[PDB]
C-alpha cells in the first residue's frame, strides 16, 4: 500500500504530458505520508480536548486549519468540505 | 459497487485512508466523512506540489519531474516550504 498510483493519476490531470522519476515519486509519496500523520496526530489531540471518542470531519477540518499555512489551509478546507458535500449528496 | 472516492469526486483512496486512520487509534473510532475530507486534502496538496514541480521540470527543459524539480518548486514556495520542510537530495 502506497499512494503512488493515485499521485500518478493526479500528475496526469495537472500535467498530461509530464512524467515522473522513481525517486521523485518516492519523495511525493513521503510528503503524503508525512502530512497524513501530521493531520491524524493533530486530529487525535483535538478529539481529546473535546473528550470525543470519534474523529469526524470537524476534527480533520480544524487540524487542517492549524497545521497548514493559511492559504493552503483555506483551499484545503474548501476541497475537503466540497468532497464531503459531494459524498453526502451521491 | 461504487467507491467512496468516486462518490466524493476524488482520485485519492478514501477506503485506504479510512483503514490507516482506524489502524493508528488516533481516537476510539472514525466517522464516515473524516476519511473523505482527509483524502480530498491530501489530493489537493499532491496536486499543488505536482503543478509547481511540473512547471519547474518544463522550465528546466525536461519532460519528467526529478527530485531537483521538487526541491526547487518547494524551496521557491513560502507555504509549501513551511508545510513540507527542505527537500534533501
Amino acid at each position: 500500500e502506497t499512494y503512488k498510483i493515485y499521485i500518478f493519476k493526479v500528475l496526469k490531470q495537472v500535467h498530461p504530458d509530464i512524467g515522473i522519476s522513481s525517486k521523485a515519486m518516492g519523495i511525493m509519496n513521503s510528503f503524503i505520508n508525512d502530512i497524513f500523520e501530521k493531520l491524524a496526530q493533530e486530529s487525535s489531540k483535538l478529539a481529546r480536548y473535546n473528550k470525543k471518542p470519534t474523529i469526524t470531519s470537524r476534527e480533520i477540518q480544524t487540524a487542517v486549519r492549524l497545521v497548514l499555512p493559511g492559504e493552503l489551509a483555506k483551499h484545503a478546507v474548501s476541497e475537503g468540505t466540497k468532497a464531503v458535500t459531494k459524498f453526502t449528496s451521491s | 459497487a461504487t467507491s467512496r472516492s468516486s462518490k466524493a469526486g476524488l482520485q485519492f483512496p478514501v477506503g485506504r485512508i479510512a483503514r490507516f486512520l482506524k489502524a493508528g487509534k488516533y481516537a476510539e473510532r472514525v466517522g464516515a466523512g473524516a476519511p473523505v475530507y482527509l483524502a480530498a486534502v491530501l489530493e489537493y496538496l499532491a496536486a499543488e506540489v505536482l503543478e509547481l514541480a511540473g512547471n519547474a521540470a518544463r522550465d528546466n527543459k525536461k519532460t519528467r519531474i526529478v527530485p531537483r524539480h521538487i526541491q526547487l518548486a518547494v524551496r521557491n514556495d513560502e507555504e509549501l516550504s513551511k508545510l513540507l520542510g527542505d527537500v534533501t537530495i
Binding site: 503512488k4 500518478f8 522519476s21 522513481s22 525517486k23 521523485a24 515519486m25 518516492g26 | -
Partner: peptide, 7 residues
C-alpha cells in the same frame, strides 16, 4: 540506479 529510472 532504480532512483533514476521512470516511475
Amino acid at each position: 540506479d532504480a532512483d533514476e529510472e521512470d516511475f
